[PDB]
């Protein structure tokens, strides 16, 4: 029973990772799935495509490595947060697509919450902001959309889950309907202080309590997946955390004030705040994180909706880059953006603005602007967003970072890391293993079954592959950023409300 | 011999053209010759007056040679040209004292800022019809006088001559015997009073321009002189020649010329309409070549925006023209592209605007952006048309169109739809040449008038608004929202 | 549970695929997974057998997960595969002793030169159906035994096993219990006697291949074994059909009677005609191979493959950059009424059937000053059709059968210009069916027959729909005139390379 | 007025050009104007004579307008031109009875088969210096007469005139007063005896060409007449363009050779006052001696050089004005095994195969547009090597340097590859319009603008030198592959 598997069910792909007791990566597999847009500003996934791709990557990562099922000591599950699925208990059939965290469809529902004066309650009790980001209003949308569904839900016929929950339920043939505190905290239906569902929110959004999973700590045996057969060895699912929380954990940011920024589909900066919730006065989120020994901690979070996804757009939709010839290649073919800024509000703006009516915009164009400039600006936007959240986080926490601890695939991009260093005037420390999300999920799972004894067993794993140090002075820094803010302001409030 | 043809010379911004027409105004022969655009620094635009002349004389010879027409056969020559572009030369030697400073040149921005700051916006609009912008010739003559040590005294002395391109051609053609312009050209200089139909003393003073350097100003249809001997008997600025060639000779008749930029003019009969909506008030030609007035607005980046796509975004070409892609999608998925690359002209006149793209989401693709870039041509045209309808209280039923881009059926239908207006595409596309020919021809009796020409003119296609037109105000609203965000981008 | 589905596994050259079909042979669900093409040196082509395995396994899990089908609802699995591609592994450990050597690999060119030189062309043709070329498996197995010191003695000792991709998959799928191939796949090895239907003693001798390494050879329709994809205590699903991909496509097109032919358009073209129960020896540069009759019994076929078809359009797009996408081909080609006298012979990797000239190289003819880009695009499309005629003239010449119709499949069949011109240049009707998944259908039919899911093919054939029929639109004179120039062109592309 | 300038008109295959130069032979002003290449079917090549006239008159007007030079300041005009290209027109009206049939056109292949069948090879080479090929004017004149019912009878009535382009231009510029040609142009017609220096009645009889349509043949440097462009300006120099280039390169003594890269490329060597017979597939033709008197040359004629680039740009769109052939070609270090045999219009010297058509070989999956561009450029150098070796064979001279032109086709990349493939230095004078210069010299001499070539000889031109950058083994490998490719493009087109 020699390995731990992390299932990392992402916004744009499903991945599976096999790790050994030394905590080295032995095998990895990834499968993409379709991003569905039924209209502009909407974002959907097919839950059966989420399941299929995640189940199949698990099969593939063992097959390719010639690992048999019975050698797996435990599974850890980590996932794209907020994304919302509602299905039939009896058949497993979804009643609607997954509504992705990114989708803006519930803006109008959000306006109602705000009009009803719920801002303070929601922040005080859930740590969250009123925005289409969070699951609660998505659940409402689906129930309002599917005639009869509310009554069925009362009848107990319909289940809600975030993606962790959908996955476990499918992996356990429906025996387990569960979530962890970190995922639950993103739903806007869960009280992050009492550590239970919040009845006022359920009342407000008219969501039957019967739909809801049990909520548990992120390091604990939740159940059995019969991937060694129904007659085989027991393979327990024993770690769950929302992906950004799992990255925080795998970065060993388990002490108050410790922070990381993950570069994925989006960008997400979290700082652990120990056992105490810190209120944001600067447009951030208060959320649940994982303590040293898997207990409930709190974090501050800045969520940026588009980072890597903007590069994917360049590739897949604008076809301005490809595999052979990536973004860093083109970007560095030019010395600046020639005045161009790109505000990547493809799905509205997240922290610290929270404007679901913002839409993607490009500024500063002249006749001598080419593709490389636009490319380069799209990349710089990742760094500019980060500064936005970093500054807000410093204000809320009282803490100035002397170094930015980063992870995610995009960190492989030297141009981006250096520009990030530059625009912040802070060093950036890049690690040798970049997919820290999966590692976090592994550690949680592993700790739960005693594969590891403690986390400090894992202290010496990470290697700072590179340190980036600022190559520009305050004046330039500050000038470039000022223009960013000019761009952002012009992108805001684009979409006409319902 | 028997004089069976009229010749139009159209000296343009990037090429010199010569066109030959018969009494039925059939296009018999056409020649086009490119010439160098000089950019000595960013935003600066110059021409070599000797290359303008050589390419204009050469195309005249070429167009006749190829058609086997001789001089004895030519009733008259009409002259039409890129306006505002400014030349200062030596009366004695015919030598320029500096390049032509092209209408596109932005070198006089500071002088313009000071004029406006000194409170002169109304005086200038009122008396010249113009906006205080580096577009127009006055500031460019000043610049040259200021640049060339000693010239202002030589100008006073009578040693130096000013001309727009019409004046320069005609002077060269008459070997210096005729120093003349028409009203339409003069109206573009910012030195001419459009009401008194004479040079404006106050402008000459504030810009410090000696009166002895200026040509005589005459009708657009009058025999001005001769060239080895053919009568030269028509002159109009190019956009005014196009308006004429479109036979827009009655109040309320309008055209749009699609090119690198768009130039829309509407005839306002014999009365000058003062703009309060960001347009130009200018001189035009009435039915018999007499002074009429017009409202005008130019969109500086139209065709140019597609060229950006071609060459810089490199998203398109000859194989793959914009219409190909545009039509791969049934809309822009909420995208608007404001190609304010050089700022915004009429009706905004914001030099600080820069180009921008709006409404992006995850599923937006290159085709939506290509489409939206084409659409912008139609939106910017709407901007001008709304202004013109506002200034004039004339709501158009139909717009006459010309230029290359009129061939683009997608664009013309979208244009009709976004306007709610018929768009009339003519059979005979050489409207600038026709305008100049008609002028020249009237002047010499080739035609007694324009009635039969009117009668026989054919519209090759009329676009009318489809049901998509009912969305035009929703769409347009999004556009105006985009323009507002592209404005005032550039830091002073 | 009611076994309502058949699954086809279609392990291809560049991807592994899994397809689910119901009793009406509706396509219920498809999955496809790419795997790495290994090019160790120019001309050399490898696959990792563990990647083939992992991707094929994973897609079968994926296709059923997405469709919500469980293993107990599968009546049978049918297997089809990229032919000739060769694997040698250790029986004991399941470990390959070397990468798969793909059909496309040219490494054995010198072995083949020596076979020819040693006079064996007729013996090889008469007994195996095959041409002496690196294409086929036998020399590949020799290369591996030669390369891997000691391997032939272990082979003798029954320690090493040979398989084509069918054989590898089924051995993996049966946990090593079943080492089998079908007649179609075996016929491609150059070690199998197509007349005695046993491994050929002389071939095994000449190539010094131990008979102990070779699988048992069986019908293309017959239960071979059982796989379990659930694990211990799971369902055992019958594996009950096997054909080489091109044969499966033949079968799928229901070309089960003498005279019936199909062409599959892809990167290459693969053309086969059924010759019933009797083998036709080629005098005209074709292959004689084993195929499947109406009840999955041994029939024979003539075959010829055009190696560059679709690939030539890929060249126009990627290398010449004359189009943005392949799909635009027909659009450009049709902007002109003809090619202005141009022919394009895309012999980029030599010429396959009917020529078999590895030394040919691509060439373009008939250029004059007024020849433009669309003339060249149009000619490059036309080449596909011309190369097709080369093979079909040979096949008529070999068989004496002038085709009633040609059934077509593959992406390019969507190209009506191409399909019409194909009809035209052949003087033969082209039949485009409503089905596209003809390889997988073929493998499905064979599996289904074996387990009695279908009693026979009678109603599949009854219910079979031709979606488009192209009829020739030029006379004999013209088609013959045009062809003669094509022929003149090919002759000058030949024997180019030193 | 002081007559301080000479103008030369260089009416080429692709464009008409005018150049105005001073007494030091410095170019004051140049203009070039393209015109349509008309292909009524593959293999055929035509020009509109009225477009030739128009673009040539316009450029003349343009150079002077530009430079501000009046007619009374010009001592003389010299005329040079694309050779062989044939025009027949109506004397009374100036109307052509058919397009110009360009030298390139292959339409008269069948007429040439008959000449060949008739055993005329030797007669034609002995008397005209030429090869039986559609290249030359005579068969093109036959074709036009044959084509236009009643034309022969009109011609005998004096109603129809024949001219090469020199003749057409001078006729047009003199309003029909002068119908003339020079020895060099006439030599290219296959109707003119290069030894007796008069029309050849056997060739006229055999092609059934009425003597009445022919112009007068004169010295290449002599006052022919004058044109009002106003003062009448002396027209006083005419040479075929490649002979004018030879003259402008100052190749006026025996053994002096050059290669001019244009639409096509053309290697000529002056052989003084003696005609040398080619045994190696070249032409014997008329050239100009130091005072513009009759000399002889050997000539290698390559049909497609610059034109192959035009094809790339204009028809294939593989290159553009902004990014040129040298730009792309240099993006790759070789052609990845590709050869382009640019027989777009048949093969010239030394092969003389009017049935060849353009062909590309050696294609593999990794061959890209850059390899093909480059290979197109290389073909220009390979064809040059073909003619150079023949020329060495015919002349008995081993060249130690190739003297080339300074025009637009003779780019750095090509010049370096030329050197490499030859194993000889290439010398490129920084002279842009060497053809026009030749024509200018001729005209100037005629009017005494210059007294002789002496002081022109002493003008130190900048000259660039390229040295061989590869070794024999490679050179010879590369060239062998070329020959392999040529063979396979030969004999492509089915005969009529
Ligand atoms: Cl369980
Ligand atoms: Cl006068
Ligand atoms: Cl079994
Ligand atoms: Cl004369
Ligand atoms: Mg076990």
Swiss-Prot record, chain A:
Q: Which family does it belong to?
A: Belongs to the FGGY kinase family.
Q: What is this protein called?
A: Glycerol kinase
Q: State any GO CC term.
A: cytosol
EC id? 2.7.1.30
Q: Does the keyword Zinc apply?
A: yes
Catalyzed chemical reaction(s): glycerol + ATP = sn-glycerol 3-phosphate + ADP + H(+)
Give the highest taxon in the source lineage. Answer: Bacteria
Task: Give the species.
Answer: Escherichia coli (strain K12)
Q: Which UniProt keywords apply?
A: Allosteric enzyme, ATP-binding, Glycerol metabolism, Kinase, Metal-binding, Nucleotide-binding, Transferase, Zinc
Report the outcome of residue 234 to A.
Drastically reduces inhibition of GK by FBP and lowers, but did not eliminate, the ability of FBP to promote tetramer association
UniProt xrefs under InterPro entries = ATPase_NBD, Carb_kinase_FGGY, Carb_kinase_FGGY_CS, FGGY_C, FGGY_N, Glycerol_kin
Q: How is its activity regulated?
A: Activity of this regulatory enzyme is affected by several metabolites. The non-competitive allosteric inhibition by fructose 1,6-bisphosphate (FBP) causes alterations in the quaternary structure of the enzyme. FBP inhibition requires that the enzyme exists only in a tetrameric state. Salt such as KCl reduces the affinity of the tetrameric form of the enzyme for FBP. Unphosphorylated phosphocarrier protein EIIA-Glc (III-Glc), an integral component of the bacterial phosphotransferase (PTS) system, also inhibits non-competitively and allosterically the activity.
**Positions bound to ADP:** 11, 15, 265, 308, 409, 413
* PROSITE patterns found in the cross-reference section: FGGY_KINASES_1 (PS00933), FGGY_KINASES_2 (PS00445)
Binding annotation for ATP? 11-13, 265, 308, 312, 409
* Residue positions where N6-malonyllysine is found in the record: 230
One GO MF term on file is:
ATP binding
Signal peptide as annotated in the record: none
| Residues that bind Zn(2+) | 476
From Swiss-Prot, chain C:
Q: Which residues bind glycerol?
A: 83-84, 135, 245-246
Tell me the keywords, alphabetical order: Allosteric enzyme, ATP-binding, Glycerol metabolism, Kinase, Metal-binding, Nucleotide-binding, Transferase, Zinc
Query: Might you report a single GO cellular component term?
Result: cytosol
Carries keyword Membrane? no
Role description: Key enzyme in the regulation of glycerol uptake and metabolism. Catalyzes the phosphorylation of glycerol to yield sn-glycerol 3-phosphate. It also catalyzes the phosphorylation of dihydroxyacetone, L-glyceraldehyde and D-glyceraldehyde. It uses only ATP.
Q: Which EC class does it fall in?
A: transferase
Q: Which Pfam families match?
A: FGGY_C, FGGY_N
Q: Which family does it belong to?
A: Belongs to the FGGY kinase family.
Q: Tell me the gene name.
A: glpK
The record, for InterPro entries, names: ATPase_NBD (IPR043129), Carb_kinase_FGGY (IPR000577), Carb_kinase_FGGY_CS (IPR018483), FGGY_C (IPR018485), FGGY_N (IPR018484), Glycerol_kin (IPR005999)
Q: How is this protein named in the record?
A: Glycerol kinase
The residues listed in the UniProt record as binding beta-D-fructose 1,6-bisphosphate, with positions renumbered to this chain, are: 234, 236
How does pH influence this protein's activity?
Answer: Optimum pH is 9.8.
Residues annotated for ATP binding in this entry: 13-15, 267, 310, 314, 411
């Amino acid at each position: 029973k020699k390995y731990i598997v992390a299932l990392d069910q992402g916004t744009t792909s499903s991945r599976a990772v096999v790790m050994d007791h030394d905590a080295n990566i032995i095998s990895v597999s990834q499968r993409e799935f379709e991003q569905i847009y039924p209209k502009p500003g909407w974002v959907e996934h097919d839950p059966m495509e989420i399941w299929a791709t995640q189940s199949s990557t698990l099969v593939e990562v063992l097959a390719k490595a010639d690992i048999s099922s019975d050698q797996i000591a435990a599974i850890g599950i980590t996932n794209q947060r907020e994304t919302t699925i509602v299905w039939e208990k009896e058949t497993g059939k979804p009643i609607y697509n997954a509504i992705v965290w990114q989708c803006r469809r519930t803006a109008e529902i959000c306006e109602h919450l705000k009009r009803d004066g719920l801002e303070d309650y929601i922040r005080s009790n859930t740590g969250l902001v009123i925005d289409p980001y969070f699951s609660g209003t998505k659940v409402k949308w689906i129930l309002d959309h599917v005639e009869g569904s509310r009554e069925r839900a009362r009848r107990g016929e319909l289940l809600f889950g975030t993606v962790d929950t959908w996955l476990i339920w499918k992996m356990t043939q429906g025996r387990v309907h569960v979530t962890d505190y970190t995922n639950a905290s993103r739903t806007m239906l869960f009280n992050i202080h009492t550590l239970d569902w919040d009845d006022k929110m359920l009342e407000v959004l008219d969501i039957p309590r019967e739909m809801l999973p049990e909520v548990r700590r992120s390091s604990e045996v939740y159940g059995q997946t019969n991937i060694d057969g129904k007659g085989g060895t027991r393979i327990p699912i024993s770690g769950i955390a929302g992906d950004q929380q799992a990255a925080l954990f795998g970065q060993l940011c388990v002490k108050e004030g410790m922070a990381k920024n993950t570069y994925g589909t989006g960008c997400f900066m979290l700082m652990n705040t120990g056992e105490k919730a810190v209120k944001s006065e600067n447009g951030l989120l208060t959320t649940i994180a994982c303590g040293p020994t898997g207990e409930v901690n709190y974090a501050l979070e800045g969520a940026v909706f588009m980072a890597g996804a903007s590069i994917q757009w360049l590739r897949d939709e604008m076809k301005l880059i490809n595999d052979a010839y990536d973004s860093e290649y083109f970007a560095t073919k030019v010395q600046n953006t020639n005045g161009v800024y790109v505000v990547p509000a493809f799905t509205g703006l997240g922290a610290p603005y929270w404007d679901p009516y913002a839409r993607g915009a490009i500024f500063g164009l002249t006749r001598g602007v080419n593709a490389n400039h636009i490319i380069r600006a799209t990349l710089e936007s990742i760094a500019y967003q980060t500064r936005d959240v970093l500054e807000a986080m410093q204000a809320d926490s009282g803490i100035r970072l002397h170094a930015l601890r980063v992870d995610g695939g995009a960190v492989a991009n030297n141009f981006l890391m250096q520009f990030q260093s530059d625009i912040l005037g802070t060093r950036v420390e890049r690690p040798e293993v970049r997919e820290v999300t999966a590692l976090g999920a592994a550690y949680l799972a592993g700790l739960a079954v005693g594969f590891w004894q403690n986390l400090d067993e894992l202290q010496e794993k990470a290697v700072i592959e590179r340190e980036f140090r600022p190559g520009i002075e305050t004046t330039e820094r500050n000038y470039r950023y000022a223009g960013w803010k000019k761009a952002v302001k012009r992108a805001m409030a684009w979409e006409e409300h319902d």
